[PDB]
Design an enzyme around this catalytic site. Structure first.
Site, mmCIF file in Angstrom:
data_model
loop_
_atom_site.group_PDB
_atom_site.id
_atom_site.type_symbol
_atom_site.label_atom_id
_atom_site.label_comp_id
_atom_site.label_asym_id
_atom_site.label_seq_id
_atom_site.Cartn_x
_atom_site.Cartn_y
_atom_site.Cartn_z
ATOM 1 N N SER A 62 72.547 23.247 30.029
ATOM 2 C CA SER A 62 72.185 24.677 30.105
ATOM 3 C C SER A 62 72.869 25.599 31.517
ATOM 4 O O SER A 62 72.532 26.766 31.039
ATOM 5 C CB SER A 62 70.628 24.686 29.983
ATOM 6 O OG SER A 62 70.044 23.575 29.413
ATOM 7 N N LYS A 107 75.355 28.664 30.667
ATOM 8 C CA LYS A 107 74.931 29.629 30.330
ATOM 9 C C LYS A 107 75.208 30.917 31.518
ATOM 10 O O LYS A 107 75.360 32.114 31.301
ATOM 11 C CB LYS A 107 73.110 29.917 29.957
ATOM 12 C CG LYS A 107 72.924 29.238 28.777
ATOM 13 C CD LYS A 107 71.674 28.857 28.453
ATOM 14 C CE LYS A 107 71.335 28.254 27.155
ATOM 15 N NZ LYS A 107 71.878 26.961 27.055
ATOM 16 N N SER A 164 66.656 30.074 28.826
ATOM 17 C CA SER A 164 67.507 28.985 28.163
ATOM 18 C C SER A 164 67.678 29.049 26.568
ATOM 19 O O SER A 164 67.753 27.945 25.799
ATOM 20 C CB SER A 164 67.065 27.672 28.670
ATOM 21 O OG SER A 164 68.336 26.875 29.029
ATOM 22 N N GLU A 197 76.285 25.406 21.209
ATOM 23 C CA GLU A 197 74.915 24.841 20.749
ATOM 24 C C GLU A 197 74.796 24.443 19.345
ATOM 25 O O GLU A 197 75.497 25.189 18.452
ATOM 26 C CB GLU A 197 73.840 25.853 21.022
ATOM 27 C CG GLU A 197 73.799 26.465 22.401
ATOM 28 C CD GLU A 197 73.051 25.584 23.350
ATOM 29 O OE1 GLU A 197 73.033 24.578 23.073
ATOM 30 O OE2 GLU A 197 72.907 26.219 24.649
ATOM 31 N N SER A 236 69.168 20.894 30.854
ATOM 32 C CA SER A 236 68.576 19.381 30.609
ATOM 33 C C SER A 236 69.344 19.167 29.327
ATOM 34 O O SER A 236 69.700 19.967 28.320
ATOM 35 C CB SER A 236 67.205 18.978 30.755
ATOM 36 O OG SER A 236 66.753 19.750 29.519
#
Length: 262
Positions: free
Chosen positions: A44, A47, A104, A140, A211
């Site tokens: 993450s 981002k 997130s 993603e 994570s």
């Protein structure tokens, strides 16, 4: 080797994984690295680069941050705490950047990557600000997969700390954009167990956690202590078993070693 490097080696030895740390102290521009040039899976934490790259687009595309973006049912991925409320409605690019950074939100990240023309657009931004190491290859939910030895979606602690410093404390972004990035990072909601848990409460922190599988547990932070100049701290951690458990506590330990030892 320093006392700090010995403590970080001891921490990794007890941890059941592979630890990467980079600290920059902007008081004197010194840097402390542990596995600082090894690649680690970002999950993450990438981002930050995507939100920053959209902020950079906004420097020349007036009102870009306020443009509505449709959230469609096909956009929903693996963790959508904000975007699942807006399906068949719209979220602006500012709302998408806030959702990706502070919650997130993975759907929000996919909209940011698409706004940049795909993962190559996020990588192109990294290259434009002098980061030759970062690479984003996927979207993603596959960014949460952290296969050992796979260089996709990785960076090094050295490179991530330098880039984070240029984005938040340096000149990679416009003044309004830099301030907005820092505001977003300071309002992160997911970091209480990670670097923040190893720092004195009075220090101001902006961070982005991450994570994924292989027990991959990450955090990248800019820290304004009292009594000294700001610090930039990156902590990456990944484990040998695919279904290893997250170790936010290892990151808190690395942050404590740094806070006490430098």
């Amino acid at each position: 080797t320093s006392a700090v490097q010995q403590k970080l080696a001891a921490l990794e030895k007890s941890s059941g994984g592979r630890l990467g740390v980079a600290l920059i102290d902007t008081a004197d521009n010194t840097q402390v690295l542990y596995r600082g040039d090894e690649r680690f899976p970002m999950c993450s934490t990438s981002k930050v680069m995507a939100a920053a790259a959209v902020l950079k687009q906004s420097e020349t595309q007036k009102q870009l941050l306020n443009q509505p973006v449709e959230i469609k049912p096909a956009d929903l991925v693996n963790y959508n705490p904000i975007a699942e409320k807006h399906v068949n409605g719209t979220m602006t690019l500012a709302e998408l950047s806030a959702a990706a950074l502070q919650y997130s939100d993975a759907t929000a990240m996919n909209k940011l990557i698409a706004q940049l023309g795909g993962p190559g657009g996020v990588t192109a931004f990294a290259r434009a600000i002098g980061d030759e190491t970062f690479r984003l290859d996927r979207t993603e939910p596959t960014l949460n997969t952290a296969i050992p030895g796979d260089p996709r979606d990785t960076t090094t602690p050295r490179a991530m700390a330098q880039t984070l410093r240029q984005l938040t404390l340096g000149h990679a972004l416009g003044e309004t954009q830099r301030a907005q990035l820092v505001t977003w990072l300071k309002g992160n909601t997911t970091g209480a167990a990670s670097i923040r848990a190893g720092l004195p409460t009075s220090w101001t922190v902006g961070d982005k956690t991450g994570s994924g599988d292989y027990g991959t547990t990450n955090d990248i932070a800019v820290i304004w202590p009292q009594g000294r100049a700001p610090l930039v701290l990156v902590t990456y951690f990944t484990q040998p078993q695919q279904n290893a458990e997250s170790r936010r506590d290892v990151l808190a330990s690395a942050a404590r070693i740094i806070a006490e030892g430098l």
